Design an enzyme around this catalytic site. Structure first.
Site, PDB file in Angstrom:
ATOM      1  N   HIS A  77       4.343   3.256  -4.558  1.00 53.88           N
ATOM      2  CA  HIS A  77       5.189   2.878  -3.424  1.00 53.88           C
ATOM      3  C   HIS A  77       5.783   4.140  -2.794  1.00 53.88           C
ATOM      4  O   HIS A  77       6.975   4.440  -2.897  1.00 53.88           O
ATOM      5  CB  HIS A  77       6.264   1.893  -3.866  1.00 53.88           C
ATOM      6  CG  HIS A  77       5.721   0.568  -4.309  1.00 53.88           C
ATOM      7  ND1 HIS A  77       5.661   0.192  -5.634  1.00 53.88           N
ATOM      8  CD2 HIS A  77       5.209  -0.468  -3.602  1.00 53.88           C
ATOM      9  CE1 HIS A  77       5.138  -1.017  -5.725  1.00 53.88           C
ATOM     10  NE2 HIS A  77       4.855  -1.441  -4.506  1.00 53.88           N
ATOM     11  N   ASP A 226      -0.133  -5.027   3.348  1.00 54.85           N
ATOM     12  CA  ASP A 226       0.459  -4.505   2.121  1.00 54.85           C
ATOM     13  C   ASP A 226      -0.559  -4.438   0.990  1.00 54.85           C
ATOM     14  O   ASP A 226      -0.437  -3.594   0.094  1.00 54.85           O
ATOM     15  CB  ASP A 226       1.656  -5.365   1.711  1.00 54.85           C
ATOM     16  CG  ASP A 226       2.618  -4.634   0.793  1.00 54.85           C
ATOM     17  OD1 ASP A 226       2.639  -3.385   0.820  1.00 54.85           O
ATOM     18  OD2 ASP A 226       3.359  -5.309   0.047  1.00 54.85           O
ATOM     19  N   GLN A 278      -7.503  -7.488 -12.377  1.00 55.82           N
ATOM     20  CA  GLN A 278      -7.881  -7.309 -10.979  1.00 55.82           C
ATOM     21  C   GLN A 278      -8.670  -8.507 -10.471  1.00 55.82           C
ATOM     22  O   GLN A 278      -8.405  -9.025  -9.380  1.00 55.82           O
ATOM     23  CB  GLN A 278      -8.690  -6.023 -10.817  1.00 55.82           C
ATOM     24  CG  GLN A 278      -7.850  -4.766 -10.865  1.00 55.82           C
ATOM     25  CD  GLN A 278      -6.816  -4.730  -9.760  1.00 55.82           C
ATOM     26  OE1 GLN A 278      -5.625  -4.916 -10.003  1.00 55.82           O
ATOM     27  NE2 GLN A 278      -7.268  -4.493  -8.533  1.00 55.82           N
TER      28      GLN A 278
HETATM   29  C1  LIG Z   1       2.782  -7.643  -8.394  1.00 56.41           C
HETATM   30  C2  LIG Z   1       1.678  -7.969  -7.464  1.00 56.41           C
HETATM   31  O1  LIG Z   1       0.494  -7.211  -7.854  1.00 56.41           O
HETATM   32  C3  LIG Z   1      -0.014  -6.387  -6.934  1.00 56.41           C
HETATM   33  O2  LIG Z   1       0.527  -6.141  -5.884  1.00 56.41           O
HETATM   34  C4  LIG Z   1      -1.342  -5.839  -7.347  1.00 56.41           C
HETATM   35  C5  LIG Z   1      -2.008  -5.778  -8.554  1.00 56.41           C
HETATM   36  C6  LIG Z   1      -1.577  -6.185  -9.917  1.00 56.41           C
HETATM   37  C7  LIG Z   1      -2.324  -5.549 -11.118  1.00 56.41           C
HETATM   38  N1  LIG Z   1      -2.598  -6.907 -11.606  1.00 56.41           N
HETATM   39  C8  LIG Z   1      -2.625  -7.319 -12.914  1.00 56.41           C
HETATM   40  C9  LIG Z   1      -2.174  -8.602 -13.268  1.00 56.41           C
HETATM   41  C10 LIG Z   1      -2.163  -8.983 -14.592  1.00 56.41           C
HETATM   42  C11 LIG Z   1      -1.631 -10.330 -14.949  1.00 56.41           C
HETATM   43  O3  LIG Z   1      -0.604 -10.485 -15.585  1.00 56.41           O
HETATM   44  C12 LIG Z   1      -2.411 -11.552 -14.503  1.00 56.41           C
HETATM   45  N2  LIG Z   1      -1.679 -12.783 -14.789  1.00 56.41           N
HETATM   46  C13 LIG Z   1      -2.060 -13.908 -13.974  1.00 56.41           C
HETATM   47  N3  LIG Z   1      -0.918 -14.523 -13.289  1.00 56.41           N
HETATM   48  C14 LIG Z   1       0.135 -15.001 -14.196  1.00 56.41           C
HETATM   49  C15 LIG Z   1      -0.388 -15.738 -15.402  1.00 56.41           C
HETATM   50  C16 LIG Z   1      -0.351 -13.693 -12.217  1.00 56.41           C
HETATM   51  C17 LIG Z   1      -1.387 -13.090 -11.305  1.00 56.41           C
HETATM   52  C18 LIG Z   1      -2.626  -8.067 -15.577  1.00 56.41           C
HETATM   53  C19 LIG Z   1      -2.660  -8.336 -16.969  1.00 56.41           C
HETATM   54  C20 LIG Z   1      -3.108  -7.397 -17.851  1.00 56.41           C
HETATM   55  C21 LIG Z   1      -3.540  -6.160 -17.404  1.00 56.41           C
HETATM   56  C22 LIG Z   1      -3.528  -5.855 -16.072  1.00 56.41           C
HETATM   57  C23 LIG Z   1      -3.070  -6.801 -15.126  1.00 56.41           C
HETATM   58  N4  LIG Z   1      -3.065  -6.445 -13.803  1.00 56.41           N
HETATM   59  C24 LIG Z   1      -2.074  -7.572 -10.405  1.00 56.41           C
HETATM   60  N5  LIG Z   1      -3.245  -5.188  -8.416  1.00 56.41           N
HETATM   61  C25 LIG Z   1      -3.348  -4.869  -7.131  1.00 56.41           C
HETATM   62  C26 LIG Z   1      -4.391  -4.228  -6.427  1.00 56.41           C
HETATM   63  C27 LIG Z   1      -4.250  -3.996  -5.093  1.00 56.41           C
HETATM   64  C28 LIG Z   1      -3.080  -4.390  -4.406  1.00 56.41           C
HETATM   65  C29 LIG Z   1      -2.079  -5.005  -5.071  1.00 56.41           C
HETATM   66  N6  LIG Z   1      -2.213  -5.241  -6.424  1.00 56.41           N
HETATM   67 MG   LIG Z   2       7.824  -3.752  -1.281  1.00 56.61          MG
HETATM   68 ZN   LIG Z   3       4.262  -2.308   0.165  1.00 53.16          ZN
END
Ligand SMILES: CCOC(=O)c1c(C2CN(c3cc(C(=O)CNCN(CC)CC)c4ccccc4n3)C2)nc2ccccn12
Ligand SMILES: [Mg+2]
Ligand SMILES: [Zn+2]
Ligand SMILES: CCOC(=O)c1c(C2CN(c3cc(C(=O)CNCN(CC)CC)c4ccccc4n3)C2)nc2ccccn12
Ligand SMILES: [Mg+2]
Ligand SMILES: [Zn+2]
Lengths: 321, 322
Positions: A77, A226, A278
């Site tokens: 960020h 975003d 991802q």
């Molecule tokens: C906060 C919002 O996330 C982003 O803005 C975001 C993310 C995050 C990285 N990612 C995750 C997410 C998880 C989870 O916990 C998945 N759980 C499922 N659901 C609840 C049960 C919620 C989605 C995860 C778990 C283990 C390891 C790695 C992990 N990585 C989402 N990647 C990108 C890429 C490009 C732009 C944005 N984002």
């Molecule tokens: Mg923000």
């Molecule tokens: Zn942003």
């Protein structure tokens, strides 16, 4: 933070290299390799989308160099993210030329550059859980209210109010566009916004002269910009991913310093589950965002296609390829 | 029965499958999720690739497809997405065992898969019968599944929708029997006797494929494996589909609470804690046995069984707090 006399005068000198001009108009363009051009690249995009006589150039260069100063040296960020989000808004508005007023293109390009102002690399849950001052101030969408507060601060500075020269009402219209756009970057609010637009487009009652309907479409656009790290070429997308987790894991590292286990997304001991995470983020958040966006704004299809291509790359990483 | 507009099926004929997807469709684990606008055209491609380009006339076919989508409801799980997901898994099973089935059966099973949950209101068989819904009185057992077949025939009997018009009237009633039997077999209440019967017919060595009664039992197991194929996708896809299933279950569990009746824990959103163990028991008793016997019959269908096992380990990793 107010920029010196020393900084912004160099920005008035900058002319974009003409070899890019065409490549910048692309949705999937990467600002990564052009770091010392990002301030002037934003000037270019403002002049192309809004006209060179839109802002008076002295005020505009100050505002861009002050906003840049107010971004902390955190992995994701940061100032690079602000210009990356601003470029996506530029591409969306360029390809939807005749849909948005002059005032909306002014605010949204400004709102995207400032939408993460003074981010400290912590989620809203972290500030609220552990009693941060800003959380004691802004109960919900904590950082997003701070981001808009930080923008209003710079705008009220001397020689910085680029909106000095609008109608007194017209100016209070801009700030509402900028506030609603920055508040809409709160990803928690995205799901309600995108589901409302789903039923509206479907029932046909989506009316583009309904202002609150316009604000919803703007909010989804703010979400699309975003997240636009998922719409670059896979070499660029995979690299921005490393920035995202480094900041997530850093927040989780603070969570461990107490004695609590962070969510696996914020745990560096769980790097192996990153490709699966991802794949889940694309299917649950990214694909819905750009799908409803492309449905509302057909010109924004390259985002949806690039997001789909990146999703299959993650699937290949999971599947042993 | 909601008929599709002409612009809906016209745009379907002009649709072309992106070159890259043509390869990924053939893989059992393929997830249609991210390509919503492509779902009707994807079924056209799967029909053409398995049954030929001259099988159905593109006019009537594109009418039948878009009208079936229009008669699928907006419930969290049993909806238009679910139909194409089941249809694709059948395509993958049919492709990997092509000459094992007749040309009329590939036409029947793919069409029956697309229509196997038509007009689903999001309520199980037990609900409609307990609260004496009118359909529970017209169909005593396999309540919704018999209605799904009636909905299927109603679409075929629409003006310009009958894709089976050019079959011999013998083969017309023949493919309707394959479709009726296939849609009935999706009633999970029947799978357990049918799978137990297939397991015994296999280990003793008496399972014959041109034994018609055996053939329907094998087609029934194939219809079951396709209906549950969400357990055979990659872990994140399967969790997301699990949320779709429970969202609809819990909605039905709320209606019984409005009537002052505790639902079963599977439909009780207050028992979300037992979700991982409930999945663990569903895999051990239902899903894993389904694909195990299916892989014994049709060994080309193994990747379903392995992917079903892969998600069994993940569900076990969740119960251990990981
Ligand atoms: C906060 C919002 O996330 C982003 O803005 C975001 C993310 C995050 C990285 N990612 C995750 C997410 C998880 C989870 O916990 C998945 N759980 C499922 N659901 C609840 C049960 C919620 C989605 C995860 C778990 C283990 C390891 C790695 C992990 N990585 C989402 N990647 C990108 C890429 C490009 C732009 C944005 N984002
Ligand atoms: Mg923000
Ligand atoms: Zn942003
Ligand atoms: C019947 C149809 O089931 C499906 O179609 C189905 C299901 C069902 C949801 N699930 C359950 C099931 C239970 C059970 O009650 C299991 N029964 C256990 N008893 C032995 C008989 C005694 C302990 C449950 C309980 C609490 C909370 C949540 C629960 N969730 C099975 N999961 C998937 C996943 C992928 C494709 C399909 N399905
Ligand atoms: Mg069914
Ligand atoms: Zn089904």
């Amino acid at each position: 933070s107010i920029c010196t006399s020393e900084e912004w005068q160099g920005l008035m000198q900058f002319t974009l290299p003409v070899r890019l001009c065409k490549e910048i108009e692309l949705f999937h363009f990467d600002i990564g390799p052009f770091e010392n051009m990002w301030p002037g690249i934003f000037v270019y995009m403002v002049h192309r989308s809004c006209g060179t006589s839109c802002f008076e150039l002295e005020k505009l260069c100050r505002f861009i160099m002050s906003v840049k100063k107010n971004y902390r040296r955190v992995p994701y960020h940061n100032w690079k993210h602000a210009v990356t989000v601003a470029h996506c808004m530029y591409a969306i508005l360029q390809n939807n030329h005749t849909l948005f007023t002059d005032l909306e293109r002014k605010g949204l390009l400004i709102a995207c550059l400032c939408h993460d102002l003074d981010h400290r690399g912590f989620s809203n849950s972290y500030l609220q859980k552990f009693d941060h001052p800003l959380a004691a101030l802004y109960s919900t969408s904590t950082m997003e209210q701070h981001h808009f507060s930080q923008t209003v601060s710079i705008l009220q500075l001397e020689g910085h109010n680029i909106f000095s020269t609008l109608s007194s009402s017209e100016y209070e219209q801009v700030l509402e566009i900028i506030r609603k756009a920055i508040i809409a970057t709160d990803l928690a609010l995205y799901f309600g916004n995108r589901k409302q637009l789903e039923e509206m487009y479907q029932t046909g009652s989506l009316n583009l002269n309904n202002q609150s309907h316009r604000d919803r479409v703007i909010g989804l656009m703010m979400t699309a910009c975003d997240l636009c790290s998922v719409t670059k070429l896979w070499p660029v997308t995979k690299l921005t991913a490393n920035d995202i987790y480094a900041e997530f894991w850093a927040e989780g590292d603070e969570m461990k310093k107490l004695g609590i286990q962070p969510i696996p997304m914020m745990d560096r001991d769980k790097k192996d589950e990153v490709p699966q995470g991802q794949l889940g983020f694309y299917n649950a958040v990214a694909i819905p965002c750009y799908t409803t966006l492309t449905q509302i704004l057909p010109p924004t299809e390259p985002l949806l296609k690039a997001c789909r291509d990146n999703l299959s790359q993650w699937e290949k990483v999971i599947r042993g390829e």
